[PDB]
């Protein structure tokens, strides 16, 4: 009561500059809810607002919608989806068995997006020629992330990295990075019959070429939002929709508990202690 | 080597009827990757395939895309998003601070979708008249889930529950539940000036009216997929994009560690032990 | 400063009847920290206090210490320990 007629003070934590919820209409980063469907933008449109707080124009709204559409689930072998089958067979629920699976996105699986942007955004803005970038790395180890594929590289393309290749070719002026990305490819495709840009490699540069080529992002929200790790945000929003699809399949078929039998273990206990 | 020329056997675990990934093109539940963009369906289209394994027709593909577009963030006060600010201020990373955030969707927050479908799907298919359904509950306690709103109910709608109301009115023949949903509303709106169908309540019935009205789902995949909890899958895919939207906001402003000061605690330690 | 000389009010959430931490010594459910080692109870002794808030007598303090000592790990086959090897190999 005493604060309502305004006589005391209070300091305020919890900055949270998104999604005004009290009042009569939920305002997003610049817009009420009903005004969104009058422009009728897709959920890429709210993916601009809730993440970047700029009205992103609808030639690229369909790009980031197309971007997570191709980074869906990738089969049950991968160590991301392999956990969330196990926590499905133990039969917990959905959301405590979705959250076991997003725990593996780290520095040796699935975070190859973040390495295939910060290896190229450094080596272009403070950059050097293509045939010394490759020369610098191949005197140190440290292979180029986003590049490497076991099955189909040359004269036999990936058939989905080329789906994005024309959609970034039409509605995207001013692409410095991706034309710098292809020129690191051409030297390396002569070097090995493998080593095309992977689908994680192109999105490592097709997303940063979405920022500094579109308007309303100058040079300071373009680099910091890759620095915080919003590029991981495209991934763990993307692979999250497949894990549940992995999960719902693992509960419809009504499987029992998994055990992982003893004939792979080979215990290496010492002599006596 | 010896299994390759096929002489031994092996039993097989891991049933996983989704996402064929070895071969040359990633086949989804019925379709290769490139054939998806030739029909050019949205990510609602892959949301049909990766969850329900049926080619969902593209009048309802835009419904489930619109369905998670309105179940974005609902404000930074709610106990879902309140955790993921705290693990943002402690500064872990993105995907461990999305991980603590989805762990709160349970039986007292945000799972009201699951109660606002299985209270109505029971009381319609094995159903009774509207003015004994309300009479049955109001001799037991157990208030109707999906209904209850503190601010704007009558002569003043919430302006987004009506947004879905026409989009389910045009492209949706055969709606038994939602017309049965509105008739539970009309008796109750006369009973109290509050108690409109909430946005979580309509989606609790607009989604089950998506299943048993559209084709390719007869009555046996329509009920079991609400029984497993795939309707929670709409929610924790939906609220997962607002959580990161809090997180990128809570790291750009570069805040320090939170402490929650002592003047709310009021320790109730006993006398001596 | 206004609440320090006590003129306004405030309702209080967060009941938490364990582990007084402000002051000079951390009091547990009935006892300061230093008084625990003067009786010298094991961590079963704090397992009585922090969970059940009763001074549990030290014939059974050694039971619940023995109780979790035999329910340790049970080999890497079981689906509990099988996950945490996988998220170890991914190196988080």
């Amino acid at each position: 009561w005493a604060r309502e007629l305004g006589l005391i003070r209070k300091p305020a934590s919890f900055m949270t500059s998104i999604c005004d919820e009290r009042g009569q209409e939920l305002i997003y980063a610049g817009m009420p809810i009903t005004e969104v469907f009058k422009e009728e933008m897709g959920i890429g449109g709210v993916l601009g607002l809730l993440w970047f707080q700029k009205r992103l124009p609808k030639y690229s709204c369909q790009f980031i919608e197309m971007c997570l559409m191709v980074t869906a689930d990738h089969g049950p072998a991968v160590s991301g989806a392999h956990n969330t089958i196990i926590c499905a067979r133990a039969g917990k629920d959905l959301v405590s068995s979705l959250t076991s699976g997003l725990l593996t996105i780290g520095d040796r699986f699935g975070g190859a997006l973040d390495a295939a942007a910060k290896m190229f955004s450094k080596a272009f803005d403070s950059g050097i020629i293509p045939m010394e970038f490759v020369n610098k790395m191949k005197k140190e180890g440290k292979l180029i992330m986003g590049i490497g594929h076991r099955v189909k590289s040359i004269n036999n393309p990936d058939m989905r990295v080329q789906i994005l290749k024309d959609y970034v070719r039409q509605h995207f002026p001013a692409t410095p990075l991706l034309d710098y990305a292809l020129e690191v490819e051409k030297i390396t495709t002569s070097k090995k019959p493998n080593l095309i840009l992977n689908v994680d490699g192109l999105i490592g540069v097709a997303f940063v070429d979405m920022l500094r080529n579109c308007g309303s992002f100058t040079r300071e929200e373009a680099d910091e939002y890759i620095d915080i790790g919003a590029l991981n945000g495209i991934f763990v929003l993307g692979r999250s929709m497949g894990f549940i699809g992995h999960y719902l399949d693992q509960k419809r078929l009504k499987q029992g508990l998994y055990r992982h039998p003893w004939d792979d273990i080979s215990y290496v206990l010492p002599e006596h202690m | 080597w010896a299994r390759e020329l096929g002489l031994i056997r092996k039993p097989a675990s891991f049933m996983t009827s989704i996402c064929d990934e070895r071969g040359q093109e990633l086949i989804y539940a019925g379709m290769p990757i490139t054939e998806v963009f030739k029909e050019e369906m949205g990510i609602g289209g892959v949301l049909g395939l990766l969850w329900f394994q049926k080619r969902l027709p593209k009048y309802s593909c835009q419904f489930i895309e619109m369905c998670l577009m309105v179940t974005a963030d609902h404000g930074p006060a709610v106990s879902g998003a309140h955790n993921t600010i705290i693990c943002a201020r402690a500064g872990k990373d993105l995907v461990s601070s999305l991980t603590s955030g989805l762990l709160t969707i349970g039986d007292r927050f945000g799972g009201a979708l699951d109660a606002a479908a299985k209270m109505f799907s029971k009381a319609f298919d094995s159903g009774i008249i509207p003015m004994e359904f309300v009479n049955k509950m109001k001799k037991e306690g157990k208030l109707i889930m999906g209904i209850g709103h503190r601010v704007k109910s009558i002569n003043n709608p919430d302006m987004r529950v009506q947004i879905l109301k026409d989009y389910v009115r045009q492209h949706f023949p055969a709606t038994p539940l939602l017309d049965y949903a509105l008739e539970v509303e009309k008796i109750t709106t006369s009973k109290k000036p509050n108690l409109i169908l909430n946005v979580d309540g309509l989606i609790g019935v607009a989604f089950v009216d998506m299943l048993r009205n559209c084709g390719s789902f007869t009555r046996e995949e329509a009920d079991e997929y609400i029984d497993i909890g795939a309707l929670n899958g709409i929610f924790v895919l939906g609220r997962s994009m607002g959580f990161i939207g809090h997180y990128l906001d809570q790291k750009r402003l570069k805040q320090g560690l939170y402490r929650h000061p002592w003047d709310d605690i009021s320790y109730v330690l006993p006398e001596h032990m | 400063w206004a609440r320090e000389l006590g003129l306004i009010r405030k309702p209080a959430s967060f009941m938490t009847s364990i582990c007084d931490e402000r002051g000079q010594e951390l009091i547990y459910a009935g006892m300061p920290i230093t008084e625990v080692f003067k009786e010298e109870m094991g961590i079963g002794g704090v397992l009585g206090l922090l969970w059940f808030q009763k001074r549990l007598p030290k014939y059974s303090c050694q039971f619940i210490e023995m109780c979790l000592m035999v329910t340790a790990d049970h080999g890497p086959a079981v689906s509990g320990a099988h996950n945490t090897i996988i998220c170890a190999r991914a190196g988080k």
Binding site: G6, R9, P11 | - | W1
Partner: protein, 157 residues
């Protein structure tokens, strides 16, 4: 070489030491006298970074910068003429001798308690030839009502 009118309605001052309550205790005195601008320009504390500290001028939020070195207090804002120190006895002397080298400051007052009498008499030679009035140690402070107030003189409002 001193001034005559020490304080006015256009006086600005910079405090030393993280003593934000007394900074708040100074800022509200500007509000009740309805002075046009706030008086506290910067807070000089070398053990933090360079950022902006939040306070409450009336009901709104105001952002006062915290600086790390004394020369960067001079660069963007050389119109400050009164410098204050609220540090303890263990660092009072070094915060003063480097200060009076910058001659744009015209008034210095010291609050700290426990200063040696030689360090008391070390300071007086330097301001004698330069002309800065010293209202130094074991002092609660001074008041010019309607215009300006030093320290927790008067206490709360």
């Amino acid at each position: 070489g001193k001034s005559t009118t020490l304080f006015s309605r256009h006086t600005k001052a910079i405090v030393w030491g993280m003593q934000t309550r007394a900074v708040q205790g100074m800022l509200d005195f500007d509000y009740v006298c309805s002075r046009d601008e706030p008086s506290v320009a910067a807070m000089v504390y070398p053990f933090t970074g360079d950022h902006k500290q939040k306070f409450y001028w009336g009901h709104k939020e105001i952002l006062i910068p915290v600086f790390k070195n004394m020369a960067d207090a001079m660069r963007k804002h050389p119109e400050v003429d009164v410098l204050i120190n609220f540090a303890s006895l263990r660092s009072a002397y070094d915060s003063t001798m480097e200060t009076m080298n910058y001659a744009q400051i015209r008034t210095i007052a010291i609050i700290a308690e426990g200063i040696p009498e030689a360090l008391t008499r070390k300071l007086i030679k330097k301001a004698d030839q330069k002309g800065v009035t010293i209202i130094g140690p074991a002092t609660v402070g001074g008041i010019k009502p309607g215009c300006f107030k030093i320290g927790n003189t008067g206490g709360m409002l």
